[PDB]
From a paper:
During optimisation of assembly, we noticed that different cations in the buffer caused the formation of filaments with distinct protofilament folds. Efforts to generate AD SFs using mixtures of salts were unsuccessful, but they did reveal novel protofilament interactions (filament types 13–17). Further exploration of the role of salts may lead to the assembly of recombinant tau into AD SFs and CTE type I filaments.
Residue numbers in the entry:
A (entry chain A), B (entry chain C), C (entry chain B), D (entry chain L), E (entry chain J), F (entry chain K), ...: 305 to 379
The structure:
Amino acid sequence: SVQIVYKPVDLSKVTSKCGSLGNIHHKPGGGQVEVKSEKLDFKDRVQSKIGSLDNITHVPGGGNKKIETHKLTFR
Amino acid sequence: SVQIVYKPVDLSKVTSKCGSLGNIHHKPGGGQVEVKSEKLDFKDRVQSKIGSLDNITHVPGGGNKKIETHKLTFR
Amino acid sequence: SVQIVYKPVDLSKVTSKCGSLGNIHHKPGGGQVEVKSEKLDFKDRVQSKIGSLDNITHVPGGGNKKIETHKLTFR
Amino acid sequence: SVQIVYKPVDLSKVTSKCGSLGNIHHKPGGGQVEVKSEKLDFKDRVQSKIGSLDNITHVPGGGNKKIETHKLTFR
Amino acid sequence: SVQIVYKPVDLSKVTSKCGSLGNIHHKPGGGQVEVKSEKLDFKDRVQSKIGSLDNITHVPGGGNKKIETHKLTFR
Amino acid sequence: SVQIVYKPVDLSKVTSKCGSLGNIHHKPGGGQVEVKSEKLDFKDRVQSKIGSLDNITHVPGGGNKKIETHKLTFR
Amino acid sequence: SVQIVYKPVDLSKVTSKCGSLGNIHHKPGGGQVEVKSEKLDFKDRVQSKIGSLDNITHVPGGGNKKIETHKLTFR
Amino acid sequence: SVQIVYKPVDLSKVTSKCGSLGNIHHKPGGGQVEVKSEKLDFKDRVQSKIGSLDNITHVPGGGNKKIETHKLTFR
Amino acid sequence: SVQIVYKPVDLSKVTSKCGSLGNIHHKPGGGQVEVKSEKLDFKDRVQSKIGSLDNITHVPGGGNKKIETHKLTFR
Amino acid sequence: SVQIVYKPVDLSKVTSKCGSLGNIHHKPGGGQVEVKSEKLDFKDRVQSKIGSLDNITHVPGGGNKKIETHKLTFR
Amino acid sequence: SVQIVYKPVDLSKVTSKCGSLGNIHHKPGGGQVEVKSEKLDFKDRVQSKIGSLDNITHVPGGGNKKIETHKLTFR
Amino acid sequence: SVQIVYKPVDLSKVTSKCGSLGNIHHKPGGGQVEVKSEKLDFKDRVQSKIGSLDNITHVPGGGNKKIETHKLTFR
């Protein structure tokens, strides 16, 4: 005398694709680099780098959440 | 005497595509770089870089949420 | 004597595409670069860069939300 | 009393680039194809094809010649 | 009393690049194909094909000749 | 009283690059294929094929000749 | 109550006659031939012939087709 | 109550006659031939012939097809 | 109540005659031939012949097809 | 004291060519011939001929005579 | 004391050419011939001929004579 | 004390060519012949001939005579 047919269907396809992806870098070339320093004074913290060709992918992001609560109640 | 059919169908395709994607960089060239520093004084914190060719993908973003509650109640 | 047919169908296509995407960079060339500094005094924090050809994709954004509450009740 | 200085310099760059080159074909999609043939008759030679998506690069050409004769004589 | 210097310099860069080259074909899709042949009759030679997605590079061409004679004579 | 300096320099760089080369085919997909044949009569030679995804590089070409004769004579 | 007579008569004399046919050549004389070649040079393909008398009959053509469907139907 | 007489008569005389046919060549004469070659040079393919008299019949052609389908149907 | 007579008569005389046929060559004469070669040079493939008289009959062609069908059908 | 040199040279080319020579008679046709004769009387010798086509070559002539004498007498 | 040099040279080319020589007769046609004779009386020798086509060559003549005498007498 | 050199040269080539020679008679046709003779009377010798086609070559002539005499007489 009561029929309950709780029959939800989920095919949802939550997707994330982040950073250097599916690319061609055929023949990249860094140039020649020279750094000359004589009588530098630093009173405080130094961060530095020197290079010619840098290729960098960082990607802090690209995360996913699925929250999917299902409830049925009767009385 | 009572029939409840609860048959929702979800095919939702939540998608994120972020950063350098599907590109051609055929023959990118960095030029020659010279840095000459003589008699410099820094009273405080220093950050620097010296490159020639830099390729960079950062992507802090591109995240997904699906929040998807399903409820049926009877009395 | 009562029939309820809760039957929503979802094919929602929530999509994000962000940054350098599907591009051709054939033969980009950075110029020759020289920096000369003699007697610079810095009283406070310094941030710098030197390069010839920089390619940068940042993308802080491009995130998605799908919020999808489904409810049925009876009495 | 006689000085001959035969000194030709050649940097000739004879180049050929032929057919589908450096292209992006993102998402080409062939249609559905049906061929129905009932009661046919062929008295002579038959050539056929049935595709949906064909990508073809032929290039019979694109060849190079450099013809470079160098002569010096004396008497 | 006679000086002959015969000093030709060749850096010639004869080059051929032929057929599908440096391309992206990201997501090419063939459609569905049906061929129905009932009551056919062929009195002479038959050639056929039935594909869905075909990718073809032929390149009969793209060949090179460098022919480059050098002569010095004296008397 | 006679000086002959026969000093030719060759750096010539005859090059051929032929066929499917440096490409990305990221996710190519052939479609479904059906061939139905009932009461076919072939009186003469038959060549056929059936497929779904074909990738073909043929390259009859792309050959090189370098022919480079050097002669010096005296009397 | 129905008489069908199908009595086609074919007497056709389809004929082809090609090349040197039904000739007299009485006393054809080739003359004296001399070729002197001193200091020749050929960078590419050579085809030659040297002779006093040639009587050459080629005939690539001269073929025949008869195509002759006959049909009778009743109901 | 039905009479079908199907009585086609074919006497057809499909004929091909090709090349040097039914000729007199009485006293054909090639003359003296001389070839002198001193200091020749060939970089690529050579085909030659040197004779006094040639009588050459080639005939790539002269073929026949007869195609002659006969059909009677009743119902 | 139904009489079918199927009496096709084929006396067809499909014929081919190719090449040097039915000829008289009474007294053909090749002359004297001389070939002198001193200081020749060949960098690639050579095909040659030297002769006084050639009587060459080639005939690549001259073939026949007869292709015939006879259908009688009743119901 | 006496020299006699009797040294005649005879190259004489005495030649005869008579009758049906070097012809083509291709398709010569004699017509129908009929003779009817009821009650004829012949009182003397009869010579008679009937026929459709005649190709008579008779040649009672065409002969050669060479009458030659060589005499040396001395005293 | 005496020299006799009797040295005649004879190149004499005595030639005859008579009758049907070097012709083409293509398609010569004789007509229909009919002869009817009731009650003729012949009181004398009969020579008679009936026919449609004749190609008679007779040549009673065309002969050659060379009467040659060479005589040397001395004293 | 006396020298006799009797040294005649004979290369004379007495030649005869008579009758049907070097012809083609390709497709010569004699027609139909019929002769009818009811109540004919012949009172003397009869010579008679009937036939469709005749190709008579008779040649009573065409002969050669070479009468040659050599005499040397001395005293």
